[PDB]
Enzyme design. Sequence first.
Site, PDB file in Angstrom:
ATOM      1  N   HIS A  41      -2.987   9.457  -2.961  1.00 27.97           N
ATOM      2  CA  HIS A  41      -2.699   8.576  -4.131  1.00 27.97           C
ATOM      3  C   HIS A  41      -2.762   9.344  -5.472  1.00 27.97           C
ATOM      4  CE1 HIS A  41      -7.132   7.915  -4.653  1.00 27.97           C
ATOM      5  NE2 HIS A  41      -6.779   7.884  -5.935  1.00 27.97           N
ATOM      6  N   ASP A  90      -4.558   7.776   3.129  1.00 34.08           N
ATOM      7  CA  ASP A  90      -4.705   8.318   1.799  1.00 34.08           C
ATOM      8  C   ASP A  90      -5.203   9.788   1.908  1.00 34.08           C
ATOM      9  OD1 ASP A  90      -4.725   8.577  -1.031  1.00 34.08           O
ATOM     10  OD2 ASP A  90      -6.506   7.384  -1.348  1.00 34.08           O
ATOM     11  N   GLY A 190     -11.337   9.212 -10.456  1.00 33.04           N
ATOM     12  CA  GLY A 190     -11.317  10.631 -10.896  1.00 33.04           C
ATOM     13  C   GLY A 190     -12.054  11.505  -9.857  1.00 33.04           C
ATOM     14  N   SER A 192     -11.374  10.960  -6.634  1.00 29.38           N
ATOM     15  CA  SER A 192     -10.494  10.917  -5.435  1.00 29.38           C
ATOM     16  C   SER A 192     -10.089  12.321  -4.967  1.00 29.38           C
ATOM     17  CB  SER A 192      -9.216  10.189  -5.768  1.00 29.38           C
ATOM     18  OG  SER A 192      -9.457   8.773  -5.802  1.00 29.38           O
ATOM     19  N   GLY A 193     -10.012  12.541  -3.662  1.00 31.41           N
ATOM     20  CA  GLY A 193      -9.548  13.804  -3.140  1.00 31.41           C
ATOM     21  C   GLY A 193     -10.761  14.701  -2.826  1.00 31.41           C
TER      22      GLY A 193
HETATM   23  C1  0GE Z   1      -7.590   7.831  -7.174  1.00 26.80           C
HETATM   24  C2  0GE Z   1      -9.091   8.059  -7.046  1.00 26.80           C
HETATM   25  O1  0GE Z   1      -9.537   8.907  -8.108  1.00 26.80           O
HETATM   26  C3  0GE Z   1      -9.850   6.738  -7.099  1.00 26.80           C
HETATM   27  C4  0GE Z   1     -11.202   6.857  -6.403  1.00 26.80           C
HETATM   28  C5  0GE Z   1     -11.995   5.562  -6.528  1.00 26.80           C
HETATM   29  C6  0GE Z   1     -13.153   5.532  -5.536  1.00 26.80           C
HETATM   30  N1  0GE Z   1     -13.844   4.280  -5.801  1.00 26.80           N
HETATM   31  C7  0GE Z   1     -15.009   3.887  -5.295  1.00 26.80           C
HETATM   32  N2  0GE Z   1     -15.666   4.675  -4.448  1.00 26.80           N
HETATM   33  N3  0GE Z   1     -15.517   2.706  -5.634  1.00 26.80           N
HETATM   34  N4  0GE Z   1      -9.079   5.826  -6.269  1.00 26.80           N
HETATM   35  C8  0GE Z   1      -8.319   4.881  -6.815  1.00 26.80           C
HETATM   36  O2  0GE Z   1      -8.221   4.720  -8.021  1.00 26.80           O
HETATM   37  C9  0GE Z   1      -7.560   3.990  -5.860  1.00 26.80           C
HETATM   38  N5  0GE Z   1      -7.571   2.623  -6.359  1.00 26.80           N
HETATM   39  C10 0GE Z   1      -8.589   1.767  -6.325  1.00 26.80           C
HETATM   40  O3  0GE Z   1      -9.677   2.047  -5.850  1.00 26.80           O
HETATM   41  C11 0GE Z   1      -8.341   0.408  -6.910  1.00 26.80           C
HETATM   42  C12 0GE Z   1      -8.758   0.402  -8.375  1.00 26.80           C
HETATM   43  C13 0GE Z   1      -8.598  -0.987  -8.982  1.00 26.80           C
HETATM   44  C14 0GE Z   1      -9.884  -1.760  -8.814  1.00 26.80           C
HETATM   45  O4  0GE Z   1      -9.824  -3.006  -8.728  1.00 26.80           O
HETATM   46  O5  0GE Z   1     -10.960  -1.125  -8.768  1.00 26.80           O
HETATM   47  N6  0GE Z   1      -9.057  -0.623  -6.185  1.00 26.80           N
HETATM   48  S1  0GE Z   1      -8.563  -1.069  -4.730  1.00 26.80           S
HETATM   49  O6  0GE Z   1      -8.428   0.091  -3.895  1.00 26.80           O
HETATM   50  O7  0GE Z   1      -9.525  -1.965  -4.153  1.00 26.80           O
HETATM   51  C15 0GE Z   1      -7.154  -1.806  -4.850  1.00 26.80           C
HETATM   52  C16 0GE Z   1      -5.990  -1.188  -4.406  1.00 26.80           C
HETATM   53  C17 0GE Z   1      -4.752  -1.826  -4.507  1.00 26.80           C
HETATM   54  C18 0GE Z   1      -4.612  -3.102  -5.051  1.00 26.80           C
HETATM   55  C19 0GE Z   1      -5.720  -3.797  -5.521  1.00 26.80           C
HETATM   56  C20 0GE Z   1      -5.608  -5.068  -6.068  1.00 26.80           C
HETATM   57  N7  0GE Z   1      -4.356  -5.688  -6.159  1.00 26.80           N
HETATM   58  C21 0GE Z   1      -3.701  -6.185  -4.958  1.00 26.80           C
HETATM   59  C22 0GE Z   1      -3.709  -5.835  -7.454  1.00 26.80           C
HETATM   60  C23 0GE Z   1      -6.749  -5.722  -6.524  1.00 26.80           C
HETATM   61  C24 0GE Z   1      -8.006  -5.126  -6.444  1.00 26.80           C
HETATM   62  C25 0GE Z   1      -8.168  -3.853  -5.904  1.00 26.80           C
HETATM   63  C26 0GE Z   1      -7.056  -3.166  -5.438  1.00 26.80           C
END
Ligand code: 0GE
Lengths: 254, 142, 191
Positions: A41, A90, A190, A192-193
Site C-alpha cells: 500500500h 499487503d 508511516g 508500514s512496510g
Molecule cells: C501505510 C502504513 O504506513 C499504515 C500503517 C498503519 C498501521 N496501523 C496500526 N497498526 N494501527 N497503513 C495504512 O495507513 C493503511 N490504512 C489504514 O490502516 C486505514 C487508515 C484509516 C483509519 O481509519 O485508520 N485503516 S483501515 O485499514 O482499517 C481501513 C482501510 C480501508 C478502508 C477503511 C474504511 N473505509 C471503508 C472508508 C474505514 C475505516 C478503516 C479503513
Amino acid sequence: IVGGKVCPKGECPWQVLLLVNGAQLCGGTLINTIWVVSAAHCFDKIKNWRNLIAVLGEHDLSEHDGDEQSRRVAQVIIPSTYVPGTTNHDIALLRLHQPVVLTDHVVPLCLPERTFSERTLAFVRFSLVSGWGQLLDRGATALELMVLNVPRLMTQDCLQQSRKVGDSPNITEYMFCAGYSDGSKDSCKGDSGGPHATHYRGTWYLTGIVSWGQGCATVGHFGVYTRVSQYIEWLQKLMRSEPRPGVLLRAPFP
Amino acid sequence: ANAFLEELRPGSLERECKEEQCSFEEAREIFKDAERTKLFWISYSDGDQCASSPCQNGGSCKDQLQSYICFCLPAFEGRNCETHKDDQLICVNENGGCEQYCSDHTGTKRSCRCHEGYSLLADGVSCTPTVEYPCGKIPILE
Amino acid sequence: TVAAYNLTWKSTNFKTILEWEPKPVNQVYTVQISTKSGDWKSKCFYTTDTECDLTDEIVKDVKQTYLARVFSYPAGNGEPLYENSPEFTPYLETNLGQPTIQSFEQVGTKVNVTVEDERTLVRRNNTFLSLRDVFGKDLIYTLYYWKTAKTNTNEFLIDVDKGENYCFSVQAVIPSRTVNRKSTDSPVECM
Ligand SMILES: *C[C@@](*)(O)[C@H](CCCNC(=N)N)NC(=O)CNC(=O)[C@H](CCC(=O)O)NS(=O)(=O)c1cccc2c(N(C)C)cccc12
Ligand SMILES: *[C@@H]1O[C@H](CO)[C@@H](O)[C@H](O)[C@H]1O
Ligand SMILES: *[C@@H]1O[C@@H](C)[C@@H](O)[C@@H](O)[C@@H]1O
Ligand SMILES: [Ca+2]
Ligand SMILES: [Ca+2]
Ligand SMILES: [Ca+2]
Ligand SMILES: [Ca+2]
Ligand SMILES: [Ca+2]
Ligand SMILES: [Ca+2]
Ligand SMILES: [Ca+2]
Ligand SMILES: [Cl-]
Ligand SMILES: [Cl-]
Ligand SMILES: [Cl-]
Ligand SMILES: [Mg+2]
Ligand SMILES: [Mg+2]
Ligand code: NA
C-alpha cells in the site's frame, strides 16, 4: 510507533527507510544484500518510479553519519491480487540496484521457511515492530527509530475481543493481529512496510509486515500485520527472477 | 464377618473389619451413631481404586475416594503415566529440538536443517554461522 | 470439524488434567498451554483422547495463571478451529487430596495423632514435595475425634479421658480459600 522506545543505534540493523523524491515514504526490512520486503500500500500513489531510494543503517533522520547506505530501488514487485485502496495481500518485494554492504549497522533479517514459521514462530508470544512513523495517531513522525514489543493473537481471539466497526476491512488468512486493545501501544501510519521480527533460539526472523490498523492504539483494536509465512514461496521464486525494464511488476499470486 | 456365636462378643474393628470384611451392620454395631458409622463406611466401602494397577511405566498410585492419582517417573506423563516423553520427537513438539528448521520423517528420526548462511553442527540440531554477517543476528550485541 | 467445548480443569494435589468434549469423529486434537506473557507449548499432539495431562507444565510454577486451548484438526492434517479453557491458577484451585492418619499414640494423658505427609506432583531436587512443602502456613489439618482440633503442622496433641478408646478422622484445609477449601475426610482409625 505509539508507546514504544528509541531503538539503540545498531539494534534494529535490518530496518529500511524508503524515500520517494528524497522524502520519507515507509519502512521496509532487508532480507539479504539485494532484496527488501515492504508493504504494497506504500506504493499506491507513486508517480516517479525511478526516484525510490532505500536507506540502510539509518537511525536519526536529523543527522548523517557514516553508517547510512543508500541504494536505488530497481524493482517493486507486488502480488497481482493486491487491490490499491484495500488491505489484503499487503506486501512488496524491492530489488535494490546494487547490493548494500553488510556491516555492524546493516544486517538482513532471516526470511524463514513457511512450515517453521507456521508451526513454531507463530507461537512465540512477543515480537518487535519498528519504524519512524507517527508517535500518536494523527501526530508527527519520529526522528529517531522507535521499537515496540507486541504480543500476537490468533484471528479468532482478535475478532471476538475487537470492537465491531461497520465497514471495516475483513481479517484474512493473509494477515494476523498483534498488540494491545487498551489504547497504550501500537504501530501507526508511516510505520508500514517495517518488520514484525520474532526471536527464536538465538536468531531473528521476519514474521510480519506493518500493514493496517484502525487509527493507532485505538481502544478495542489491535494492529494488523501481513502474514509473511503465506508468501515465502512467492518471495523465493521472485528473488530468482530476472530484472524487467519498468520498476513496478505485478506478479501472480500464488 | 459372621460365624457361630461370634456376635455374643462385643464388636471389634480390628477383629471384624481389619482382619475380616465387615458388613455395614457389623460396623454400626461398633460405632453406634449413624453419622460415625457413615464416616467410617464412606472410605471403608469405597474400594481401593489402585488395585487395578492403573499407573504404568513404574509409576506410583495413591488411592482417593472413587479415584486415584498417578505419580510418574521423570520420563512419563499422562493420567496413568502412559505417555512416553522419549517417543515425542516430532517437529510440532518444541520444533523437534532443532535450533532452526525441523523436518518430520515418519518411522525414522526427524532431521534438523539451517537457513542459508549457517551450517548444521555435529550434534544434529545446532546451527553455526558460515559467513561474517549471517541473517537475524545483531552484531553490536554479540 | 467442530471446536471442543466444556473445557474443564481436573486437578488434585497438582496432578492436572484438562478434559473436553466431544468425542472426535474424523478429527483429532492438539492442546497448547501458556502463561499470559509466555510462549505457547504444545502437548498431546494429534490425540483422539478428550483429555490432556498438563501436570508437568503447571508444576514449573504452581502460582502462575495458565490458559490452555484445544485445536481440532480434520482427519489427515488457515488457522484451525479451537476453543480456550478457563484460566487456571494451580495454587488457588487444585483440590487437596484425601489424607491418611499415619499413627496415633497415648503419651500418658494425651494422644498424639500424626497425619501422613500428602505427596503432590511438584518435584524439587529430584523428589516429590508434600502439600505442607508447597503450601507452608497456608495449609492446616483439622481433626474430628470422639470434638475438633486444628494444627499448623501434621501433628495434633489432644486430651483424652484414660482407658477410653477414641476414633479419629482428619481433613486438609486451606483456610484462605472460599471454594475447594477442604479435602474429603481421611479413613477413620480407632484406638
Ligand atoms: C501505510 C502504513 O504506513 C499504515 C500503517 C498503519 C498501521 N496501523 C496500526 N497498526 N494501527 N497503513 C495504512 O495507513 C493503511 N490504512 C489504514 O490502516 C486505514 C487508515 C484509516 C483509519 O481509519 O485508520 N485503516 S483501515 O485499514 O482499517 C481501513 C482501510 C480501508 C478502508 C477503511 C474504511 N473505509 C471503508 C472508508 C474505514 C475505516 C478503516 C479503513
Ligand atoms: C483400574 O485400572 C483401570 C485401567 O487399567 C482404570 O480404568 C480404573 O479406573 C482403575 O480402577
Ligand atoms: C512411587 O513413585 C514413583 C514415581 C516411583 O518412584 C516408584 O518407584 C514409587 O514406588
Ligand atoms: Ca541519519
Ligand atoms: Ca467375625
Ligand atoms: Ca461379626
Ligand atoms: Ca458384631
Ligand atoms: Ca477372625
Ligand atoms: Ca451383628
Ligand atoms: Ca478409594
Ligand atoms: Cl544504487
Ligand atoms: Cl492505522
Ligand atoms: Cl503434608
Ligand atoms: Mg489383628
Ligand atoms: Mg445389629
Ligand atoms: Na489499543
